[PDB]
Amino acid sequence: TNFTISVTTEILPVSMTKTSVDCTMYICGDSTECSNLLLQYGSFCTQLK
Amino acid sequence: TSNFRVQPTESIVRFPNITNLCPFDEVFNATRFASVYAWNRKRISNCVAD
Ligand SMILES: *[C@@H]1O[C@H](CO)[C@@H](O[C@@H]2O[C@H](CO)[C@@H](O)[C@H](O)[C@H]2NC(C)=O)[C@H](O)[C@H]1NC(C)=O
Ligand SMILES: *[C@@H]1O[C@H](CO)[C@@H](O)[C@H](O)[C@H]1NC(C)=O
Ligand SMILES: *[C@@H]1O[C@H](CO)[C@@H](O)[C@H](O)[C@H]1NC(C)=O
């Protein structure tokens, strides 16, 4: 015999913050020998980028 | 493609001043030496080690 106009809130996530990292700076930094040693590993951090 | 970096040139400030000589000859050229069970310990600090 009666009706109620109810209101509800529904929350869904949309997206997260984009994060960009680099192999050379994060792993060791400015070491040239570290870069030379990492160059022999291949393109792992290129694939990560 | 890559990252941007700034090249370095040269240092800024030195170590503590080094103008002495570490007496390494006290433990190297000694008149008498000690035994294995009771050796001698000499603390060497605040000097230049060669
Ligand atoms: C259906 O329900 C609503 C409330 O959910 C009723 O509205 C109330 O009516 C009384 C008397 O008419 C008022 O004193 C209230 O202030 C009203 N409430 C609101 C929120 O407006 C309504 O009367 C009901 N319908 C029937 C046919 O009984
Ligand atoms: C050298 O050492 C002395 C004390 O050992 C210090 O006072 C002084 O600042 C140092 N540097 C120079 C350039 O004299
Ligand atoms: C003897 O002492 C001198 C300085 O006192 C030192 O230069 C030298 O190494 C020591 N040993 C020998 C075998 O000369």
Swiss-Prot record, chain A:
Domain of life: Viruses
Name of the gene this protein is made from: S
Covered residues, full protein: 716 to 764 of 1273
Function field: Precursor of the fusion protein processed in the biosynthesis of the S protein and the formation of virus particle. Mediates fusion of the virion and cellular membranes by functioning as a class I viral fusion protein. Contains two viral fusion peptides that are unmasked after cleavage. The S2/S2' cleavage occurs during virus entry at the cell membrane by host TMPRSS2 or during endocytosis by host CSTL.
Stated consequence of mutating T1I: In strain: Alpha/B.1.1.7
Protein's name according to its UniProt entry: Spike protein S2
Disulfide bonds: C23-C45, C28-C34
Sites carrying sugar chains: N2
